[PDB]
Structures are given as structure tokens and as C-alpha cells.
Design a protein around this ligand. Structure first.
Ligand SMILES: Nc1ncnc2c1ncn2[C@@H]1O[C@H](CO)[C@@H](O)[C@H]1O
Ligand code: NA
Length: 215
């Protein structure tokens, strides 16, 4: 326990020292919710290593540095209305909730993972994260519009529904690529002057499967 946390603290210090974690907000979220709380027992021993890890149903939880990079790009603030597409283990959602101090909506298409995430969240005492079973490539109309939409699965293109559901001045962070498993991390800003896109380099995420994702 405290041992796992000590290794985690070292990982957070490393991410901070190397300029990956750049804000006190993201630093605080990482320190409150260590990744070991979101993986199966057999992988907890590796939760501090900056590498992706497997989770149930053939999916994965991203490497700590990638989760940090995406949260920093999001420039999250308390009170924001955030939608995460691809709950997985629930780790990222927990982190987001610690930063925005309010209800966070996250969508997962695999029933087994919806259960897995809910259990992890409950065990960690999280209450503001709301896990919904469904096809997140269609976003989540009930609580739109969103300040930021963070997609943790790779798409073949930018899903229109996610753009429609963004507040003006908001942004969509999503991996887009012509390969199911190898993508480019895009920061899609919905500005008063139109869509502005910043490419943040190559990444490797599981595919976003759905009506507006991969078949
Ligand atoms: N259309 C989708 N909606 C919600 N979650 C999805 C979708 N496609 C893939 N995922 C999920 O993305 C998660 C990645 O963090 C995986 O657990 C995967 O099942
Ligand atoms: Na996660």
C-alpha cells in the first residue's frame, strides 16, 4: 500500500521534473488517485512504470505520461462540464473529477468495463464520476454542451457529434488515424472563428468502435 504509493510518488515527481505534469492541478489529481487503484491486482506492481497496462476485455489503461499530457492540454478548471469517451478502468475519469470538482460524464461501450470502472471508482470513494454504457462516438446529448471532450480511443476521423456537443471556445482531444491502433493526437478547438487543430504527435490507443468511429 504505502509502498505502492511511494513508487507512485516517484513517478509523479519524475513526470513533474521532466515537464510532463505542468500544473499543480494535474499534480494534485495524480497524487490523490494513483494508477494502482484502477488496475487488476496482478498489474498493481507495475502501475508506477510509465507504460500502458492491460485491463479487462482486451483493452488497456494508457501510460501515465500520456494521461498527463492529455489532461494538461485540456486546461481543466473547477466547474467545467467534461465528457470522457472511453472509460476503461475509470482512472482518467477519477483524475478529471478531482480537477473539476463536479459531475463528470464518461462513456464505455463494453459492459464488463462499465462494471469494472464503477467498482474501481466506488472502492476509491469517488462519487462525482458517472459511467454510462453506450457508444461514445455519438457523444452524450443529455448533458451537452461540454467545455472539453477527452477521447481515449482512436478514431478514423473527427466524430461530428463530438464537435456539435462542444461549447464555443471548448476543445476536443482525440486520437485520429487511418489505422485502428496507431494514431495522431489531435487537439480540436471549436473557436468563434472555426475549427482550429493542433497535432500533438503519434500515439497508440485501442480503437474507438461505433457509429462515428470504426465499424
Ligand atoms: N464508441 C465507444 N464509446 C465508449 N467507449 C469506447 C468506444 N469505443 C471504444 N471504447 C472504449 O475505450 C476505452 C479506452 O479507454 C476502452 O475500454 C474501449 O472499450
Ligand atoms: Na483511464
Amino acid at each position: 500500500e504505502k509502498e505502492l504509493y511511494e513508487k507512485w510518488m516517484r513517478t509523479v515527481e519524475m513526470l513533474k521534473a521532466e515537464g510532463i505534469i505542468r500544473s499543480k492541478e494535474v499534480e494534485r489529481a495524480f497524487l490523490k488517485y494513483p494508477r494502482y487503484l484502477s488496475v487488476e491486482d496482478k498489474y498493481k506492481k507495475y502501475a508506477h512504470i510509465d507504460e500502458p497496462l492491460p485491463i479487462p476485455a482486451g483493452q488497456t489503461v494508457s501510460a501515465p505520461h500520456m494521461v498527463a499530457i492529455m489532461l494538461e492540454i485540456a486546461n481543466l478548471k473547477p466547474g467545467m462540464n467534461i465528457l470522457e469517451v472511453g472509460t476503461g478502468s475509470g482512472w482518467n475519469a477519477a483524475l478529471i473529477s478531482e480537477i473539476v470538482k463536479t459531475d463528470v460524464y464518461t462513456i464505455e461501450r463494453i459492459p464488463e468495463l462499465v462494471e469494472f470502472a464503477k467498482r474501481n471508482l466506488e472502492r476509491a470513494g469517488v462519487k462525482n464520476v458517472h459511467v454510462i454504457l453506450g457508444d461514445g462516438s455519438k457523444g452524450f446529448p443529455p448533458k451537452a454542451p461540454y467545455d472539453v471532450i477527452i477521447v481515449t480511443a482512436g478514431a478514423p476521423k473527427i466524430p461530428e457529434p463530438l464537435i456539435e456537443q462542444l461549447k464555443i471556445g471548448g476543445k476536443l482531444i482525440i486520437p485520429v488515424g487511418s489505422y485502428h491502433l496507431w494514431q495522431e493526437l489531435l487537439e480540436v478547438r471549436k473557436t468563434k472563428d472555426g475549427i482550429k487543430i493542433k497535432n500533438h504527435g503519434g500515439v497508440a490507443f485501442v480503437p474507438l468502435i461505433g457509429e462515428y468511429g470504426w465499424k
